[PDB]
Amino acid sequence: GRVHVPIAPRCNIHCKFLMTADDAIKHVEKVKEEMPISVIGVAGPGDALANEETFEFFKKASKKFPDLLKCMSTNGLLLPDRADELAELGINTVTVTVNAVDPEIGEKIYSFVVYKDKVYHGREAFEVLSRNQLEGIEKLAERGIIVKVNSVLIPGLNDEHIVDIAREVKKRGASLMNIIPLIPMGEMKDYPRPTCEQIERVRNEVEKIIPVFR
Numbered sequence: 001g002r003v004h005v006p007i008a009p010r011c012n013i014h015c016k017f018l019m020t021a022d023d024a025i026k027h028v029e030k031v032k033e034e035m036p037i038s039v040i041g042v043a044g045p046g047d048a049l050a051n052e053e054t055f056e057f058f059k060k061a062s063k064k065f066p067d068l069l070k071c072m073s074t075n076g077l078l079l080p081d082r083a084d085e086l087a088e089l090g091i092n093t094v095t096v097t098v099n100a101v102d103p104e105i106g107e108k109i110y111s112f113v114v115y116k117d118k119v120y121h122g123r124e125a126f127e128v129l130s131r132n133q134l135e136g137i138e139k140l141a142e143r144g145i146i147v148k149v150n151s152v153l154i155p156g157l158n159d160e161h162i163v164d165i166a167r168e169v170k171k172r173g174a175s176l177m178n179i180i181p182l183i184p185m186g187e188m189k190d191y192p193r194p195t196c197e198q199i200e201r202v203r204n205e206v207e208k209i210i211p212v213f214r
Contacts, residue, residue, distance in 0.1 A: 002039040003031050007053040011046035013075050013129060014111045016187040017099070017152055018045075021057035025064060032065075041071040043095075049078035058089040069093065073150070077115060077129050079136020087143040094140050095148040095178075096133055101168045103127055105158050134172050141173025148176045148213070153202060155182070155194045162202050166209040178213040179203050 005024035019027060028040055040061060042048040049072075058070060072086075073095040086094065100106035106126030113125040120128050137147050149169045151162055158165075166177055179202055181194045194202075203212050 001036055002041060003028055003037055004041045004043050005057065006045055007057055008042055008044060008048045008051040009046045010050045011075075012050040012077050012115065013047070013113045013125075015075075015099070016109060016111055017154060017182060017191075021053045021060060024057050025060050028061070028065065037068065039069040039071060040065060041073070043073040047075055047077070048072040049074045049082050055082075055085060055089065058091065062090050066090075071095070073097070074136075075129065076133025076136040077113060078132070080132055080139060083136055083139035083143065083145075086140065087145060091145055093146040093148060095150055096137055096140075096169075096174075097150045097152070098133060098137075098165055098169055099152050099154070100126070100158055100161060101130060101134070101165050102161060103130070105161055106130055108157060109154070134168065137169055137172040137174055141175075146176075147172075147174045148178060149174045150178045150180055152180050152182050153194045153199060154188075155192055155198065157191065159194065159198065159202065163205050163209060166206045170210045174210065176211050176213055177206055179206060 005019055007019050007024050042054050048054045070091050071093040076096040099109050103123050103126050107123040110126050113120045113129050115128055140147050151165050181199050184191050206212050
């Protein structure tokens, strides 16, 4: 019962691990006529916040679809600058991908970040992303938007660090954490998919700090 529309091509970060807005509206209305829908979301293919089409779409969906839950996923880089607008457009839930809170780990996950038309590399890239996404969680949460945090479990990189993430995002106002196992491909093809003993171990530990999606 959830429709995601692909209207957000541009991404503003490089992590190592199409419709117009009006065409997406017509798609939702056609899908609603054939299937019960309760949620509309924007999640990709890039970052939702890095694309003006995202906000044009939710503006129109506000009028045409007041009853539906509205959600989006983002890396959070633009959340401090867009959090107010998201609230005004009726976004109910935002999923923020947070893969580290310690820069010695985060610098190994992100290669660069593009923010206000400056390219940051390496450790500075993660520090900019991390500050913005964590502040963004609190700006969303204080406006009533449900914040869900996605964290990719990278064995040998952040596996023992996920509970630190959970403590930090809980302090900022997150409601739920979703631990996602790494699927190695291309960049970081040399990392393994986590064992299922490990994924359920970390889920059980995180659950003591914040609710976990299951």
